[PDB]
């Protein structure tokens, strides 16, 4: 009955995103019969990396606007000003995001 | 009412570690939540397709690695593979 105190699998992987919740969503999402132990760790790390990349670009875009809070416009500016992120979120509409200020050069 | 899980506290922890003095509105938090759910479903569906093509029953970290390599474009895939590999290799040595 000498049961150790529970450590979350996010802390063993060094992550902020939940490894156990990603494991449950992989098991209940009808993806395969079996889910390996390292698959939710790898997936939670990839999701944490992508979230951190978008949030850092949006925080930089909010700081350039002299704002301290990220609004949907800052996420839209972070995503559409980056070719890889615009290619990843290609057919994605961000609500309240607006458009890029693109006026055609032949008009001026 | 039910429990209605989300990713808001993890997105907030990640934001506090990349921008310690920056907040986020609730409309942008919903967009980040939708983004995490969409990328989860994309990677998990591609890994399910990869396990089915090879007649495997298990989604391992190898299937997740090749699904990330198929879905993310450019250097995004390289740094995501680096992050997932270092998380798996420090998880197994624990």
């Amino acid at each position, epitope marked *: 009955k000498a049961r150790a105190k529970a450590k979350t699998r996010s802390s063993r992987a060094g992550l902020q995103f939940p490894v156990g919740r990603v494991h449950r969503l992989l098991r209940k999402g009808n993806y395969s019969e079996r889910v390996g132990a390292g698959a939710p760790v790898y997936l939670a790390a990839v999701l944490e990396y992508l979230t951190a990349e978008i949030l*850092e670009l949006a925080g930089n875009a909010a700081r350039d606007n002299k704002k301290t809070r990220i609004i949907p416009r800052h996420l839209q500016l972070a995503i559409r000003n*980056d070719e890889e992120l615009n290619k990843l979120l290609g057919r994605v509409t961000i609500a309240q995001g607006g458009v890029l200020p693109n006026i055609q050069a032949v008009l001026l | 009412r039910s429990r209605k899980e989300s990713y808001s506290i993890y997105v907030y922890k990640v934001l506090k570690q990349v921008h310690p003095d920056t907040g986020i509105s609730s409309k942008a938090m919903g967009i980040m939540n939708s983004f995490v759910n969409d990328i989860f479903e994309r990677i998990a569906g591609e890994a399910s397709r990869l396990a089915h093509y090879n007649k495997r029953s298990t989604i391992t970290s190898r299937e997740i690695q090749t699904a990330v390599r198929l879905l993310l474009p450019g*250097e995004l895939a390289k740094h995501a593979v680096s992050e997932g590999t270092k998380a798996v290799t420090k998880y197994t040595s624990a």
Partner: single-chain antibody
Amino acid sequence: EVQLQQSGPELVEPGTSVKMPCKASGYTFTSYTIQWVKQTPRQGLEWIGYIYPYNAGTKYNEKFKGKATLTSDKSSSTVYMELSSLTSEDSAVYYCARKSSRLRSTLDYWGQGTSVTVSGSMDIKMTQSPSSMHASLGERVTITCKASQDIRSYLSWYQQKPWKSPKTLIYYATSLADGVPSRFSGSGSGQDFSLTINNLESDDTATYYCLQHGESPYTFGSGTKLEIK
């Protein structure tokens, strides 16, 4: 492979303007920024600015506003750099370097260099603690790059043999670059960083720079010249 074909040297007079191309090949040209670095043998490496050819978006160092102007050309996959109102201070080698738009990426591939021969306190200072050292042929070498402010891990290490372009060793303060052996090892976060070379070879004699890219002007280290026996 990825090549950044740069033009040959010039011998000009003051007041002139020089366009130096950075024709790129081997990769998707719009997906990567092209950075510009000036190397004088008085202040070392200085970061001029970049241009992102995906949207023609530039960002300059405040030390080079008005002096430098970056343009791109999607048809020829070529980035130009104009140097207006040339002074005697503007005689150096100007490298163009490819950096991805990802935040943890660094200046990966460099051009050969174009040697121009003519006839600011709120930045981050990179302090390399040994300015030079001498080493054996198999012992340990450790170079440090104590910083001014808190960069998180956005620090890379470069090796420059004389009369050659710099070569990336380590990015993101620990990760090995492509084609770099595991003798090179990086560590640190916050303000103090370290580069360790484990077993020295005959070709490990060069100048070793550290580059931060965590804040808005990028600042190189002062340099560490390593001689071996």
